[PDB]
């Protein structure tokens, strides 16, 4: 399904642009920076081929991709920012 498929692909491309952003310099080590690029490039690639696949199959790739990113996301918070009436909102 194109609508669910779109969110996954856009998530992947944006996530890559994010970790490579000059703003997050010194907020991530190049090892963790590299493994996001890898898994995003891997998920994008999979979507390119598997356009016949079924919902569970799509779902597995989704769970997999957030199993790599969430930990790295959590470490971005753990930096010296951490990672932020507008001020009166949850982060």
């Amino acid at each position: 399904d194109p609508f669910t498929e779109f969110s996954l692909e856009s998530y992947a491309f944006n996530m890559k642009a994010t970790v490579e952003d000059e703003k997050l310099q010194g907020k991530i080590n190049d090892e963790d920076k590299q493994k996001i690029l890898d898994k995003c490039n891997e998920i994008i690639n999979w979507l390119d081929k598997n356009q016949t696949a079924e919902k569970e199959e799509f779902e597995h790739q989704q769970k997999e991709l957030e199993k790599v990113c969430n930990p790295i996301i959590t470490k971005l918070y753990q930096s010296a920012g951490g990672m932020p009436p507008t001020i009166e909102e949850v982060d």
Binding site: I73, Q78, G81, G82, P84, I87, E88, D91
Partner: protein
């Protein structure tokens, strides 16, 4: 469920103005990983909306043990101090929040100077004693 997943559920609840339920999520997130400062600041904010100055103060304290460069930890902490009438500390924390945001190039409009200006006024309304 992961700590990040739990924070996001809590954030959705916060936007929905279901504050107690959002705080419970932040706690659960804290349990799985207690070393992330934002989970503490978010919950402090729930407490602030629930009108509980004391518990919010403690979460700020925890947040600052992990992240001493946090604008929101310093900010909400000042605000808790203001509601407990500790004026001098509150202006300090708000100004410390104000320095950090400038350094980090953060943009909250006129949110910090407003808060500062209110606290400076509140303080004078207290000194009426001689």
């Amino acid at each position: 469920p992961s700590a990040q997943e739990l924070k996001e559920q809590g954030n959705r609840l916060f936007v929905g103005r279901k504050y107690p339920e959002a705080a419970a999520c932040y706690g659960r997130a804290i349990t799985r990983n207690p070393l992330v400062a934002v989970y503490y600041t978010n919950r402090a904010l729930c407490y602030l909306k629930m009108q509980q100055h004391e518990q919010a103060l403690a979460d700020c304290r925890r947040a600052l043990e992990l992240d001493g460069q946090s604008v929101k930890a310093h900010f909400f902490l000042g605000q808790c101090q203001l509601e407990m009438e500790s004026y001098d500390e509150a202006i300090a924390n708000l100004q410390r929040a104000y320095s950090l945001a400038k350094e980090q190039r953060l943009n909250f409009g006129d949110d910090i100077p407003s808060a500062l200006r209110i606290a400076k006024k509140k303080r004078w309304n207290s000194i009426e004693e001689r």
